[PDB]
Amino acid sequence: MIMEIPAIKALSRYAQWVIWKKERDTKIPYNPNNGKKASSTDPLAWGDIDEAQAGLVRYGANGLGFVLTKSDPFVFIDLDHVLDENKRVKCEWARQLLKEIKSYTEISPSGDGLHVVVSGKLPDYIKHKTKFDDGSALEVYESGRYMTITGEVFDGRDDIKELDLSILGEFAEHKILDDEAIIDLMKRKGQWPDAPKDGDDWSSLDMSFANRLAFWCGKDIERMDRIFRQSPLMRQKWDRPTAGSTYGRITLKKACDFVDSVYDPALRNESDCPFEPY
Numbered sequence: 001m002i003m004e005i006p007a008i009k010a011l012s013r014y015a016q017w018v019i020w021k022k023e024r025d026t027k028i029p030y031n032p033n034n035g036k037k038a039s040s041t042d043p044l045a046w047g048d049i050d051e052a053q054a055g056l057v058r059y060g061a062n063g064l065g066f067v068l069t070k071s072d073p074f075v076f077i078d079l080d081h082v083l084d085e086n087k088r089v090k091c092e093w094a095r096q097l098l099k100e101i102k103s104y105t106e107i108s109p110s111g112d113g114l115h116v117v118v119s120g121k122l123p124d125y126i127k128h129k130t131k132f133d134d135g136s137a138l139e140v141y142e143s144g145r146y147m148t149i150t151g152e153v154f155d156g157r158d159d160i161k162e163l164d165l166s167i168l169g170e171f172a173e174h175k176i177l178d179d180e181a182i183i184d185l186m187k188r189k190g191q192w193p194d195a196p197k198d199g200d201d202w203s204s205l206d207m208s209f210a211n212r213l214a215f216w217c218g219k220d221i222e223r224m225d226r227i228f229r230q231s232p233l234m235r236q237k238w239d240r241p242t243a244g245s246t247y248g249r250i251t252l253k254k255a256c257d258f259v260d261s262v263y264d265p266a267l268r269n270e271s272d273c274p275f276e277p278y
């Protein structure tokens with residue numbers, strides 16, 4: 001019974017509730033009172049839990065949501081893909097976290113992840129998202145975003161606790177936007193490649209994309225390398241030693257000796273791009 005959960009009762013004091021609908025792999029928040037999409041920073045796009053449960057029924061949404069703000073005391077800890085087919089923790093980093101951070105825990109909508117809600121403050125030196133080799137991930141937010149609420153309590157952790165969160169540094173990577181500006185620009189111009197297909201010459205796709213990187217990044221090799229590692233063409237071969245270097249570095253160096261023109265963001269000579277879009 002979701003309204004008997006103490007954590008739900010605590011969250012029920014706040015008028016920061018939304019409903020959400022499944023769109024592809026995304027979960028879009030919706031204003032629980034008029035059925036339109038909800039901003040995550042507009043307080044009047046939300047409602048209290050009574051308006052959210054009424055809107056859940058009235059529009060047939062997929063579930064409830066709660067918007068975290070920097071003024072409320074709640075921290076949202078998201079553990080992606082940490083459960084097996086029997087809803088038991090299969091990642092040892094997640095099991096260790098649950099042992100050190102005992103607060104309200106619920107199974108996320110996909111059934112293979114967890115949510116942890118704590119009253120506290122995130123440490124200042126950790127990254128928001130941390131990905132692991134087994135596909136699992138740890139995402140932490142305390143504001144600017146909403147969280148789905150399922151009420152499927154995990155191992156009886158039904159109460160939100162006030163806890164110090166400095167131990168989150170044991171699990172999240174530590175910190176010690178122009179790249180995304182270049183990446184999004186290449187996508188708008190149709191210069192962003194898609195994943196290789198079965199019959200493709202992958203290495204030839206690498207050089208086509210590397211040549212386009214040389215223009216849009218202005219022959220900034222370090223920038224070209226950072227962007228390639230988050231492209232659909234990245235693989236282990238990119239870092240395999242090759243002659244005096246790596247296959248990727250030889251690819252990027254070759255692209256600069258080849259490409260003539262260079263994109264200058266202060267001039268925006270997008271027309272100088274020697275390569276047609278994909």
Ligand SMILES: Nc1nc2c(ncn2[C@H]2C[C@H](O)[C@@H](COP(=O)(O)OP(=O)(O)OP(=O)(O)O)O2)c(=O)[nH]1
Binds near residue numbers: 078
């Ligand atoms: N504004 C906005 N928020 C989103 C969107 N998709 C997800 N969120 C929020 C709601 C989720 O609770 C939270 C974490 O995202 P996830 O992909 O991990 O979904 P969630 O944990 O709810 O379920 P799941 O991991 O699939 O079991 O981010 C979106 O497309 N737009």
Ligand SMILES: [Ca+2]
Binds near residue numbers: 078079080108113114
């Ligand atoms: Ca999740």
Ligand SMILES: [Ca+2]
Binds near residue numbers: 069074142143
């Ligand atoms: Ca908060």
